Design a protein around this ligand. Structure first.
Ligand SMILES: [Mg+2]
Lengths: 78, 1327, 542, 49
DNA sequence: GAAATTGGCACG
DNA sequence: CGTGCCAATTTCT
């Protein structure tokens, strides 16, 4: 016996994050945004915790909101 | 005289040889085997009696108490076969054994028992065989295959002479018991005899002989003949037997009676032997040089000293001779050991033998058996006595004893089941005799040396295997003294016996799912002989000699029906007339010939007896009483065919088809087919799926009816009567008055099987073939089955075929098919598939099946009823929901966001998940059946009550019919009696039916009570719950049925090994046509006949055209209404055609409405029967082609459908019988781009149901390395298969329009490194 | 994660083999530690150390020192060594050969309309194999503005995804492979053509290389992804690149069975065929006469043929002359490319006279003319084989009239020698050898008589007299042209089958004197089974 | 990727370097395989120094 | 089952 | 002490 790899919600979200024309910083932000999504699809942390997880001084909350508004229209919508 | 079923459509028979023996019941082997196991036997053997008597009485270790055995009994099954199949349980019977416990008195073993207690005890359930030779185990029918193994006994078989480089032949023997340890005797290149026990290390042959309490003197007495030298006052005079000098050259001077008969250097001739015999010469004086190497027989001791002059069995010398002669000894015993005939083997073995005692031999055997433990005298003696001389560990069974005695040329057939000294001595003597030159080795492939073991014997063996463990448990428990309290029910436990019995029938190797895509597949699976399995050969080590046709297969095993592949010659099939005698050896019938006239007497001869007689052939002519026409007949004598005289014959073959099996006797014109193609045809004929409508072969062999009836797929009337009710799902027959039991309402009710699923996901469906109010008799069919037409086997369709090349669309076995074949749905099949939804019990509450799934919309729930199960008749597809199931998620603490979510959308949406059953991807069909199983205690929903109401609606119908008949009879009697006692005519009619008479009216009230009790008894079983599993609440099964049409890629075939794949579906106006404009259904390639040499498919084509030519005349006489006087005249002309045929059909005994009914069935072509090796000659096909006006050549001229111009040469058109094999292109096509990967080695999974990828193995890597394709090979090793980080990059690049890869490293080499370095080996990548 | 537990329905985490072998070792080690701490007597600690040694040995390599420990089903547990080595180990199952993506398989059928650089691929298999390409092409031209929109469009199979598929499969080779891959010609690259159905259509001429026939075979298709794989499949593995066998250097694209039958039937002559002796002005007039029905395909005529030959520099010079040929050869001359002589088709073309024609074309002209010539040869052969209306009947197997006389003479001789042995003149072995010789001579006599009767026929001449010509028998044409069949099969069809051999190998003296047009009785059919089972088992085991 | 280790309470011989026919331990110590097996599996003693 | 290598014993 | 034959063991379809 070996097993089989099932596709969860975060794997599906990453499959679309990698196929979206982001930038190097936008994809790093999207990784944190997708990581903090529970099984019901709701963001579990404030955007101030994602801006802190990025670990960059020049990124502002506007970019995080812009990336979140794009991630929010993936499949499933909402 | 014909039966009612055969009189509807009589198949014309071209056979010309009368039959004397009719084909037996084909499934007789399985039933006869199992009946021995089940039935009670007054003697111990043959069944459960043997198993019980081979263990009981079970007694304690000198506890003076034992368990006895009285008898056994089998109870009644709870459910019959159909209930066990629809319910998913086993059809078995409970076993009740009357056990008895006796308690004697201490110190008085002979004293009367102080207490006896007897009580029948349940010892598990044993599965029962149905009336068709199959077992249902878990709702599914299974078949236990017979086995062909080596018979127990002694077999002498030398090596071929290859082991030794010099080429010396090494002879050996072997004793094989039914249950025990082996025993081998063998020779070495040094010509000494050696013994091998249980295939262990080799030992000298005299170890066992000394362990049997023998001394050297008596050993030499047994194995040698004595010559006594007499010292008559000088120089070692000798007693002479003239025969001893045979094949000897004298090295000294032989002289007697004053005459030197033999000089020095003269070899004795036969003339000298005759002269010595005439003169009776006995005394010869020899010099001392003759005894320089002669061996002394016994021990000689000096009379003075009393010590040992010389030990036994060593050669004498001159000094030793002087020493033994100076001590006053007169007789010297020597062993006649001439090197040619009476060879010195055991004496010289004694020299190599280390021990010369009786007690150290047991020590040596104990060392050989169990090494590295101290040898104890008692332990060694017990081991030796338990090896071959204990009834509880060694069993040379009755077959083994018979073979042993008959091989040793004994007289008694029956004896004991344990070896003795005499048996081993005889085996050694026979081996030495074979070495000396009078004796032959056996062949282990003779069918007189191989035995048939069937289901009953194996079941008995497994039952004994369980019983011995039960016996061990009883013996261990009975040591404790509590006799006055316990009863026999407490001692034994039914779990081991039941477990062993169920493991034999459930998960053995010879117990397999029944092949159920034909009646022929079933009837040839039940009649199968397998050389594999537990106790038999192995596929890899089988060899080359067990896979060949032996001359003893004639009439016992079919030679042209065996799978082609890894196991060819190991899974052979039983013949038609073959049987098994009381010992399990196959035997075949023969017709006795006395004084050169065949006397119709049938004797069943086995392979051993068959070789003694001279047996004639089935194709030998005899003249009206039995007299061979030619005085130089053909016969088989001793396994070699040869030509014998007229008066030397002893037997004759009973039929011309007793050499071939059932499957190979359904091929017309078999004698015109190459033996390589007949095998393929017979193998492919049993994997043809049943089509929508059955079609008779129209060219057959006459074996269709036997296969159709014996395999229980039809509905055969149990008793004769008149059909009183006909329906698409039931038949009610009113039995005759002279076939009814006393006090019985005579009706037979047959419930037909409608659209049930078989083991191969095909359709099983029975349709009636009788009409309302027509007579029936016992034994004729009432309803057809899958692939059956009026009680005749029908596996395919009759296609109008032509042999010609057509623009390359029938190139290299391809088939070109017309469009009308697809329009008429001739090869359309129905496939049924089941799905299951199980609702289990979790810790956070149980799962429930409900129609309101929280997240899905109102459209997906459109085809679900109030109970959440799909409607019957709904056409599902893709991912439709079949069963609405919900599993509970709970124990989540409330939060303000969770409360806000729960308030707006309701509490039902929350705390529940969705686990509903959905149709898989790519699966479609129509819901035709839903089955609900509910564990007892759980409350049934509305659907599971509706199903039960439907089930109850039918038993009420049956009981109502019986009650109606009985009430009508009783009320008629009441009215008649009351009219006799007071005449009333009309006042009774208006009076209510309620109004000696008291006794008659009591019977009505009793009958009502009885038929009310029966209905309650049936309801109490209809409403009974199930026992599903630990933690399972409900199971819902849904069946989907889909119709598969024909298309390019589907595989079709024929009965002569001519398979093919459809390549095109050609429109009608493109197919070739003849003068009348009739197109051709199928076009075949003529370049397949000359090389394959299956000429039978062309004779079948011509005969089918001739047969359709008669139907085309009958149809033409029927369309324009003709008087019956012409119809019966033409049909009689058709049935009279032939050259000395055996069939006689006269239509003057047929009424007009029977001639019309026959001619209505004969309007699609007259069926024709051509038996194998006794078929229709070529000169009679041409008479049939002239009866209906057709060309004699069998070839007509064809026109091109596209250009309209005639083909330059005549082509062969006709009607051939085509099958649709179960290799559909719908189940073959597969594709994959990206899916799910494995876990440990992240590579794509394998298979079609897992959406797996194609394996790119080693041989395909070699082909890419030979081309020079390095990038194509690198992308199939890392990016497309295994490199985890490269798969996503490649996918992203392909979607981005950039075709470039970053190779990376496979993920299955890191696993290799981690597994190598977990063995303590430091492997690493460097630099 | 390399030794995971198996989750099966019912909440059961069944322990695997490696975890069992680790738990055993850990239990023994903990027991030994506790016993050594307690200062137990030396007997118990020695037993514990021995059992720990046995447990470690079973973990590292189970069963190497006898008595492999078994699981529930009495089957030995798999250790690390069993996972590394063997046919089921890492090396031979996951590293030297793997399962791959972008791959499918299905049953192969025949397409006679193809060119040998293209194959027929179902349009429902190519939609799955080429899916990321379809996504990229869909969202490249604005049909889908997101990956999920293209995913939905492909999922519901709209009417434009088929145009997208036809655009993306235009020039993109696919590798077709059939197992077993015995040599490098078992994997070849073709250009797809989208067909309707579920079966792959394979070009006929490439069937010899694959050793594939259409009676249930299946093939696997793989898609080259990168830009170097698409050029390796086009310049190295393409089907039009390998037309010579790498083993010996001979062509591997020879027409096989009913491509040579049509070319044999077309290129033949008859003594008094319709419209013979007339003078034609070229191949076009010959075809116009044949189609119009004014002349036969075998009529001997005179036609004006122009043929080109290469000079020293390589230029083509033409020569025109009147050839004595047939109508069928003039029609075939329209296919031969320029630069080849007319004597290459002015004969009856069997199977060896067609392969040498392609070899000559390859050696004189090149690779492209050879490919075009092979395709045209296949087309013409198929067309005229279909047009000929050839068939096979039961009257095409002409039994010689002298067969029974030969058999009777042989029987008389064997009876005479049987009596001679009965008189004691000869030994049993000598009698056996002489009987075998007699039957071997009778078989040859029957075969020669049958073949002399079969291979010729009579025909009325141009005038009233008669003449003799080669037979137009359907079976004789298949055997003589090399289409299919040989001499031995025709001998078994129309002459005695001959001497058979027992499984040991010794010849049975009494032969099978019956062919397949006649029947074999029960005893004559039981020895051919010995032979057939030997033959089948040999292949099945080799 | 992360491995672990078990601290054996007593030394244990590697079976690969013992039971492979060119016995690496036997060839190094110049002892027959039977002697090494009997010492390892606690059936006999051996003198060291 | 066949074949190659290794340890044990008869022999010179 | 030094060679060669024979039984055991292993690995491979
Ligand atoms: Mg094939």
């Amino acid at each position: 016996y070996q097993g089989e790899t099932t596709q969860t919600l975060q794997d599906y979200l990453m499959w679309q994050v990698e196929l979206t024309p982001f930038s190097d910083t936008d994809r790093a932000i999207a990784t944190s945004i997708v990581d903090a999504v529970d099984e019901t699809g709701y963001l579990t942390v404030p955007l101030e915790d994602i801006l802190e997880s990025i670990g960059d001084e020049e990124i502002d909350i506007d970019e995080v909101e812009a990336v979140l508004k794009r991630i929010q229209r993936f499949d499933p919508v909402g | 005289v014909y039966s009612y079923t055969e009189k509807k459509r009589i198949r014309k028979d071209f056979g010309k040889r009368p039959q004397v023996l009719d084909v037996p019941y084909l499934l007789s082997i399985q039933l006869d085997s199992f009946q021995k196991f089940i039935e009670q036997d007054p003697e111990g053997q043959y069944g459960l009696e043997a198993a019980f008597r081979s263990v009981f009485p079970i007694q304690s270790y000198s506890g003076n108490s034992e368990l006895q055995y009285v008898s056994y009994r089998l109870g009644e099954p709870v459910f019959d076969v159909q209930e066990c199949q629809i319910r998913g349980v086993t059809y078995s019977a409970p076993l009740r054994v009357k056990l008895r416990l006796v308690i004697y008195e201490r110190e008085a073993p002979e004293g009367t028992v102080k207490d006896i207690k007897e009580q029948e005890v349940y010892m598990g359930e044993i599965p029962l065989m149905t009336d068709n030779g199959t077992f249902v185990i878990n709702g599914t029918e299974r078949v236990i295959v017979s086995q062909l193994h080596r018979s127990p006994g002694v077999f002498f078989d030398s090596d071929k002479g290859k082991t030794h480089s010099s080429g010396k032949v090494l002879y050996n023997a072997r004793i094989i018991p039914y249950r025990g340890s082996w025993l081998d005797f063998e020779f070495d290149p040094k010509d000494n005899l050696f013994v091998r026990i249980d295939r262990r290390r080799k030992l000298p042959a005299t170890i066992i002989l000394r362990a049997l309490n023998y001394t050297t003197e008596q050993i030499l007495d047994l194995f040698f003949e004595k010559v006594i030298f007499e010292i008559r006052d000088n120089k070692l005079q000798m007693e002479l037997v003239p025969e001893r000098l045979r094949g000897e050259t004298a090295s000294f001077d032989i002289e007697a009676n004053g005459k030197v008969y033999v000089e020095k250097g003269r070899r004795i001739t036969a003339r000298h032997i005759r002269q010595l015999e005439k003169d009776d010469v006995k005394l010869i004086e020899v010099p001392v040089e003759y005894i320089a190497g002669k061996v002394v027989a016994k021990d000689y001791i000096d009379e003075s000293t009393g010590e040992l002059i010389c030990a036994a069995n060593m050669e004498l010398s001159l000094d030793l001779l002087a020493k033994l002669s100076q001590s006053g000894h007169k007789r010297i015993e020597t062993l006649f050991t001439n090197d040619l005939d009476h060879g010195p083997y055991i004496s010289e073995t004694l020299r190599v033998d280390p021990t010369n005692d009786r007690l150290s031999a047991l020590v040596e055997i104990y060392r050989m058996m169990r090494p590295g433990e101290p040898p104890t005298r008692e332990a060694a003696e017990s081991l030796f006595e338990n090896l071959f001389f204990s009834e509880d560990r060694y069993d040379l069974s009755a077959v083994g004893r018979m073979k042993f005695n008959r091989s040793l040329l004994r007289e008694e057939i029956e004896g004991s089941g344990i070896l003795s000294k005499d048996d081993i001595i005889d085996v050694m003597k026979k081996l030495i005799d074979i070495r000396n030159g009078k004796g032959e080795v056996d062949d282990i492939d003779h069918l007189g040396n191989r035995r048939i073991r069937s289901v009953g014997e194996m079941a008995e063996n497994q039952f004994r295997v369980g019983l011995v463990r039960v016996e061990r448990a009883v013996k261990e428990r009975l040591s404790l003294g509590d006799l006055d309290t316990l009863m026999p029910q407490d001692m034994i436990n039914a779990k081991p016996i039941s477990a062993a019995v169920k493991e034999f029938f459930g998960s053995s190797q010879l117990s397999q799912f029944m092949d159920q895509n034909n009646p022929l597949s079933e009837i040839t699976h039940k009649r199968r002989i397998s050389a594999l399995g537990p106790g038999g050969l192995t596929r890899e080590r089988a060899g080359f000699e067990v896979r060949d046709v032996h001359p003893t297969h004639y009439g016992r095993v079919c030679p042209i029906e065996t799978p082609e592949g890894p196991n060819i010659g190991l899974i052979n099939s039983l013949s038609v007339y073959a049987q098994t005698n009381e010992y399990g050896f196959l035997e075949t019938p023969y017709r006795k010939v006395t004084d050169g006239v065949v006397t119709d007497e049938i004797h069943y001869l086995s392979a051993i007896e068959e070789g003694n007689y001279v047996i004639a052939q089935a194709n030998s002519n005899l003249d009206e009483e039995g007299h061979f026409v030619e005085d130089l007949v053909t016969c088989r004598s001793k396994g070699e065919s040869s030509l014998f005289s007229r008066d030397q014959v002893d037997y004759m073959d009973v039929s011309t088809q007793q050499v071939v099996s059932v499957g190979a006797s359904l091929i017309p014109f078999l004698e015109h087919d190459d033996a390589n193609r007949a095998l393929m045809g017979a193998n492919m004929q049993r994997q043809a799926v049943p089509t929508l409508r059955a079609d008779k072969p129209l060219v057959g062999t006459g074996m269709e009816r036997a296969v159709a009836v014996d395999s229980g797929v039809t509905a055969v009337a149990k008793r004769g009567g008149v059909v009183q009710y006909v329906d698409a799902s039931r038949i009610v027959i009113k039995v005759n008055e002279d076939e009814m039991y006393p006090g019985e309402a005579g009706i037979d009710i047959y419930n037909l099987t409608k659209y049930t699923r078989s083991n191969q996901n095909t359709c099983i469906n029975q349709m009636p073939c009788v009409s309302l109010g027509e007579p029936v008799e016992r034994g004729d069919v009432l309803a057809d089955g899958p692939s059956t037409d009026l009680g005749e086997l029908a596996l395919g369709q009759n296609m109008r075929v032509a042999f010609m090349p057509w623009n390359g669309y029938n190139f290299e076995d391809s088939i070109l098919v017309s469009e009308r074949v697809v329009q008429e749905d001739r090869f359309t099949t129905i496939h049924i598939q089941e799905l299951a939804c199980v609702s289990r019990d979790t810790k956070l509450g149980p799962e429930e099946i409900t129609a309101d799934i929280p997240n899905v919309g109102e459209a997906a729930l459109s085809k679900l009823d109030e109970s959440g199960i799909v409607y019957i008749g709904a056409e599902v597809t893709g991912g439709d929901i079949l069963v609405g199931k919900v599993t509970p998620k709970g124990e989540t603490q409330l939060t303000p966001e969770e409360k806000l979510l729960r308030a707006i959308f309701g509490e039902k949406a929350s705390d529940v998940k969705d686990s509903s059953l959905r149709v898989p991807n790519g699966v479609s069909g129509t819901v035709i059946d839903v089955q609900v199983f509910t564990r007892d205690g759980v409350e049934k929903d509305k659907r599971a009550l509706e199903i039960e109401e439907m089930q109850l609606k039918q038993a009420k119908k049956d009981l109502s019919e019986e009650l109606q008949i009985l009430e009508a009879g009783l009320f008629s009697r009441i009215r008649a009696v009351l009219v006799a006692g007071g005449v009333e005519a009309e006042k009774l009619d208006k009076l209510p039916r309620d109004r000696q008479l008291e006794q008659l009216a009591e019977q009505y009230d009793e009958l009502k009570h009885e038929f009310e009790k029966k209905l309650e008894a049936k309801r109490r079983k209809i409403t009974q719950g199930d026992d599903l599993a630990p933690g399972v609440l409900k199971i819902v099964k849904v069946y989907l049925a889909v119709k598969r049409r024909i298309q390019p890629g589907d595989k079709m075939a024929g009965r002569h090994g001519n398979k093919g794949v459809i390549s095109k579906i050609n429109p009608i106006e493109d197919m070739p046509y003849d003068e009348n404009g009739t197109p051709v259904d199928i076009v075949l390639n003529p370049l397949g006949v000359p090389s394959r040499m299956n000429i039978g498919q062309i004779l079948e084509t011509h005969l089918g055209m001739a047969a359709k030519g008669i139907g085309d005349k009958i149809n033409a006489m029927l369309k324009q209404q003709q008087e019956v006087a012409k119809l019966r005249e033409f049909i009689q002309r058709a049935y009279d055609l032939g050259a000395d045929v055996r069939q006689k059909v006269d239509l003057s005994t047929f009424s007009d409405e029977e001639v019309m009914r026959l001619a209505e069935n004969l309007r699609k072509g007259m069926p024709i029967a051509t038996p194998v090796f006794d078929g229709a000659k070529e000169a009679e096909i041409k008479e049939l082609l002239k009866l209906g006006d057709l060309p004699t050549s069998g070839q007509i001229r064809l026109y091109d459908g596209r250009t309209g111009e005639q083909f330059e040469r005549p082509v062969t058109v006709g009607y051939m019988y085509m099958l649709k094999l179960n290799h559909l292109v719908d189940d073959k096509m597969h594709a994959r781009s990206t899916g799910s990967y494995s876990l440990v080695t992240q590579q794509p999974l394998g298979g079609k149901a897992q959406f797996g990828g194609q394996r790119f193995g080693e041989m395909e890597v070699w082909a890419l390395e030979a081309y020079g394709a390095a990038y194509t090979l690198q992308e199939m090793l890392t990016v497309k298969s295994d490199d985890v980080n490269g798969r996503t990059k490649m996918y992203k690049n392909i979607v981005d329009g950039n075709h470039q890869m970053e190779p990376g490293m496979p993920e299955s080499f890191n696993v290799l490194l981690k597994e190598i370095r977990s063995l303590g080996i430091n492997i690493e990548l460097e630099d | 994660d390399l030794r995971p537990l198996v989750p099966l329905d019912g909440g059961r985490f069944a322990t695997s083999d490696l975890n069992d072998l680790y738990r055993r070792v850990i239990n023994r080690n903990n027991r030994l530690k506790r016993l050594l701490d307690l200062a137990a007597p030396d007997i118990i600690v020695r037993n514990e150390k021995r059992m720990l040694q046995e447990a470690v040995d079973a973990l590292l390599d189970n069963g190497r020192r006898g008595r492999a420990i078994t699981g529930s089903n009495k089957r030995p547990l798999k250790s690390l060594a069993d996972m590394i080595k063997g046919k089921q180990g890492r090396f031979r199952q996951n590293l030297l050969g793997k399962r791959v993506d972008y791959s499918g398989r299905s049953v192969i059928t025949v397409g006679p309309y193809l060119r040998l650089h293209q194959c027929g691929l179902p349009k429902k298999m190519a939609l799955e194999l080429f899916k990321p390409f379809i996504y990229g092409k869909l969202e490249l031209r604005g049909l889908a503005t997101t990956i999920k929109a293209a995913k939905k469009m492909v999922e519901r199979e709209e009417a434009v995804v088929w145009d997208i598929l036809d655009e993306v499969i235009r020039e993109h080779p696919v590798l077709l492979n059939r197992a077993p891959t015995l040599h490098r010609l078992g994997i070849q690259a073709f250009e797809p053509v989208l067909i309707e159905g579920k079966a792959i259509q394979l070009h006929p001429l490439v069937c010899a290389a694959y050793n594939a026939d259409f009676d249930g075979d299946q093939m696997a298709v793989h898609v080259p992804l990168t830009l170097e794989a698409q050029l390796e499949a086009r310049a190295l593995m393409m089907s039009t690149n390998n037309i010579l066998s790498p083993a010996n250097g001979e062509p591997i694209i020879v027409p096989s069975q009913d491509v040579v039958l049509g070319l044999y039937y077309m290129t033949r002559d008859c003594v008094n065929a319709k419209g013979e002796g007339m003078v034609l002005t070229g191949p076009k007039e010959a075809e116009r006469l044949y189609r119009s029905g004014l002349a036969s395909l075998h009529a001997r005529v005179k036609v004006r043929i122009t043929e080109y030959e290469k000079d020293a520099n390589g230029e083509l010079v033409a020569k025109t002359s009147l050839k004595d040929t047939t109508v069928g050869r003039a029609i075939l001359w329209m296919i031969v490319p320029k630069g080849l002589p007319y004597s290459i088709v002015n004969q009856a073309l069997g199977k060896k006279a067609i392969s040498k024609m392609l070899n000559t074309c390859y050696r004189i002209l090149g690779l492209k003319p050879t490919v075009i010539f092979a395709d045209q040869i296949m087309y013409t052969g198929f067309a005229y084989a279909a047009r000929s209306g050839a068939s096979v009947g039961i009257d095409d197997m002409v039994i010689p009239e002298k067969k029974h006389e030969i058999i009777s003479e042989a029987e008389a001789e064997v009876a005479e020698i049987q009596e001679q042995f009965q008189s004691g003149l000869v030994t049993a072995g000598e009698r056996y050898n002489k009987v075998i010789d007699i039957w071997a001579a009778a078989n040859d006599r029957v075969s020669k008589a049958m073949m002399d009767n079969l291979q010729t026929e009579t025909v009325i001449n141009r005038d009233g007299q008669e003449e003799k010509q080669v037979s137009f028998n359907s079976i004789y044409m298949m055997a003589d042209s090399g289409a299919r069949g040989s001499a031995a099969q025709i001998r078994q069809l129309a002459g005695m089958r001959g001497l058979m051999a027992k499984p040991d190998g010794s010849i049975i003296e009494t032969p099978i004197t019956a062919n397949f047009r006649e029947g074999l009785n029960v005893l004559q059919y039981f020895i051919s089974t010995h032979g057939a089972r030997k033959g089948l088992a040999d292949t099945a085991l080799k | 990727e992360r491995m672990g280790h078990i601290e054996l309470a007593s030394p244990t011989a590697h079976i690969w370097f013992l039971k492979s026919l060119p016995s690496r331990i036997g060839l190094l110590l110049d002892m027959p395989l039977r002697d090494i097996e009997r010492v390892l599996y606690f059936e006999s003693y051996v003198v060291i120094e």
